[PDB]
């Protein structure tokens, strides 16, 4: 019942038949559709040799997949594949048993082989990344397009504050309309909110930081300290942080009636990007000096310094997910996206982005980053910090992109550019309670 080694039996499959058998975004879907059709075709058309071969369990589809030249359980582990001659196969059949008549019965309704039917009934993986053209665009005429500007900003109440020209407009996602807050003589450069959307901290083009109320639509107060234009704003629940072109790093304690709390002038050139660390008392700073500084709290001493930039850099901020990870953008001649670690002095990544970087947005439940660009390609670049590989690139802006932000659910992202467009994409998606549920 077992064939001899020195005198193997010949299968019906011929020399060139194995040469045939072994031969191999919507594009991926079509390619997957073509491959299963080809595999099914060569499985069904062949297999008479494979049916005569094999010893137990396994399948003809497994034999074809094993030929070298959500997953269900593989039956057996044999990877013999196609072969001209077989040794083990001596013609033998199992006696008919109730399982066999059950099997031949479910086969009676099948016009194709059971193995091919199982392959087709098996579910293909529905694993794709959709980063396509925006599904919604609203109106925002006359948007500022200056390199030292950062205007749009997310709030938890589905509320966006935009500095359109010389007036502050309010866009509500829940309503889809535009509401005007106020206007002044000098143009705005930076926007921010304090608390839970109660106050709106806005920086002007002369450093005249005036806080304007949201619900009451009034100017709360009028501050000074900068002799040049503000560039960006940040805060951690009690103190606003302001950076400006005149090297001013101003922390404003909104508790006392005079918010101005401390000032820092530790940089060598103008300050353009400044995002406070909300979780820990640290600060990330930089600008056009090709120098990125990390401070502890409000002290002027730079705890960390990294100088790998080469041109005007605007994009630098902390990543909410992993602590101490600071992502820094590129320049006009630098174009290097650089990811840094605080408290360890470790360079995580440094990769050419293909264009100057101005703003960054981090996801909420995944390690996906989107970065703005300007003066080089007027586009947006997606990033994965875990594997260092771009996924998709977003373009289509008449003027450079500078302003970006993340939604509450981490799905919607907003872009700010001089093209008067707001492009919205969609990239993503205990016994105390035991006592509560006793009364119903």
């Amino acid at each position: 019942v077992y064939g001899d080694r020195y005198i193997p039996s010949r299968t019906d499959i011929d020399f060139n038949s194995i040469v045939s058998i072994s031969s191999m975004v919507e594009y991926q879907k079509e390619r997957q559709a073509h491959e299963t059709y080809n595999t099914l075709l060569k499985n069904e058309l062949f297999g008479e040799m494979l049916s005569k071969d094999t010893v137990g369990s396994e399948s003809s589809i497994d034999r074809i997949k094993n030929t070298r030249p959500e997953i269900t359980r593989p039956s057996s582990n044999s990877v013999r594949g196609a072969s001209l001659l077989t040794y083990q196969q001596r013609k033998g059949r199992r006696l008919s048993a109730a399982s066999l008549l059950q099997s031949q019965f479910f086969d009676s309704m099948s016009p194709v082989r059971p193995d091919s039917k199982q392959l087709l009934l098996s579910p293909g993986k529905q694993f794709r990344q959709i980063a396509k053209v925006p599904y919604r665009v609203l109106d925002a005429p006359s948007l500022a397009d200056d390199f030292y500007y950062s205007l749009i900003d997310w709030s938890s109440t589905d509320v966006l504050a935009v500095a359109l020209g010389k007036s502050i407009f309010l866009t509500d996602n829940n309503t889809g309309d535009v509401v005007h807050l106020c206007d002044t003589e000098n143009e705005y450069t930076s926007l921010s909110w304090i608390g839970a959307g109660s106050h709106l901290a806005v920086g002007q083009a002369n450093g005249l930081v005036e806080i304007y109320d949201v619900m009451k639509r009034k100017c709360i107060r009028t501050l000074s300290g900068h002799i040049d234009r503000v560039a960006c704003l940040s805060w951690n629940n009690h103190v606003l942080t302001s950076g400006s072109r005149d090297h001013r790093i101003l922390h404003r304690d909104v508790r006392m009636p005079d918010p101005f709390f401390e000032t820092i002038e530790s940089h060598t050139q103008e300050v353009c990007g400044l995002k406070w660390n909300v979780a820990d008392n640290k600060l990330a700073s930089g600008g056009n000096d090709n120098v990125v500084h990390v401070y502890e709290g409000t002290s002027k001493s730079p705890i960390l310094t990294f100088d790998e930039h080469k041109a005007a850099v605007k994009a630098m901020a902390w990543s909410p997910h992993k602590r101490g990870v600071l992502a820094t953008g590129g320049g006009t001649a630098d174009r290097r996206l650089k990811i840094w670690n605080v408290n360890t002095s470790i360079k995580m990544s440094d990769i050419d982005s293909g264009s100057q970087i101005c703003n960054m947005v981090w996801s909420k439940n995944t390690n996906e980053l989107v970065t703005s660009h300007g003066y080089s390609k007027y586009n947006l670049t997606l990033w994965d910090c875990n594997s260092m590989d771009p996924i998709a690139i977003l373009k289509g802006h008449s003027f450079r992109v500078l302003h970006l932000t993340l939604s509450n659910d981490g799905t919607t992202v907003v872009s700010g550019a001089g093209d008067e467009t707001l492009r919205y994409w969609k990239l993503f998606d205990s016994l105390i309670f035991d006592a509560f549920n006793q009364i119903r």
Binding site: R136, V137, D139, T421
Partner: peptide
Amino acid sequence: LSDITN
């Protein structure tokens, strides 16, 4: 407004 022209 959508309907962005080339």
